[PDB]
Amino acid sequence: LNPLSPDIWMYVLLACLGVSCVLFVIARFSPYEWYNPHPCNPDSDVVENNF
Amino acid sequence: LNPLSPDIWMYVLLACLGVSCVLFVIARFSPYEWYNPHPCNPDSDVVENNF
Amino acid sequence: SAMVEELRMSLKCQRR
Ligand SMILES: CCCCCCCC/C=C\CCCCCCCC(=O)O[C@@H](COC(=O)CCCCCCCCCCCCCCC)COP(=O)([O-])OCC[N+](C)(C)C
């Protein structure tokens, strides 16, 4: 645990919960992650999100 | 950011734009990357490229 | 025959 200071182990953890919540909000907001889950059935409306 | 000299950080960023713009040309021009989607569904030839 | 594909690799907006 030594080679990084005990404060900068917390800046990693706040970034690991920070970026993982920013990625979730952007992936629901973006109208290009909402894809069609059926390749074999293209012209349906079951448009989903894997985030 | 110092262990590579500040030209090297530019030559690896011109190499990302250099390779991703020659991977784009080769993946189109090669007729083997033009795979067929709809693996269970038969023909009418709607082959496409994911590059 | 190669000239058939020289136009076919230039659709640019694929699905063909
Ligand atoms: C969407 C946002 C929310 C979600 C984010 C993710 C969640 C949380 C993310 C990370 C969690 C950790 C917190 C981050 C900072 C901690 C580190 C720190 O100490 O402060 C740092 C930054 O502090 C500054 O000096 C402010 C400078 C700008 C910072 C904001 C970026 C704005 C971009 C503007 C341009 C945009 C351009 C865009 C187009 C190119 C450095 O401080 P220091 O002075 O070195 O400290 C002194 C100590 N000393 C004396 C010993 C040296």
Contact B29 C9 (CB under 8 A): yes
CA-closest candidate to residue A1, choices A14, A18, A13: A13
What letter would DSSP give residue B40?
S
d(CA B28, CA B40): 24
| Gap from CA of A7 to ligand 1 centroid (Å) | 15
**Chain center to CA of B4:** 26
> And the tokens for A30?
């973006």
HSE-CB for A35 with a 13 A CA cutoff: 7
At residue A29, φ and ψ (nearest 5 deg) are -80, -30
C9 to chain B: which residues are within 8 Å by CB?
28-29, 31
Q: B42: buried, middle or exposed (CB in 10 Å: 19+, 13-18, 0-12)?
A: exposed
Phi first, then psi: give them for residue A35, nearest 5 degrees. -110, 170
Report helix, strand or coil for B35. Answer: strand
Resolution reached, in Å?
Answer: 3.2
Tally of CB atoms within 10 A around A21:
10
Residue of chain B nearest C11, judged by CA positions: B28
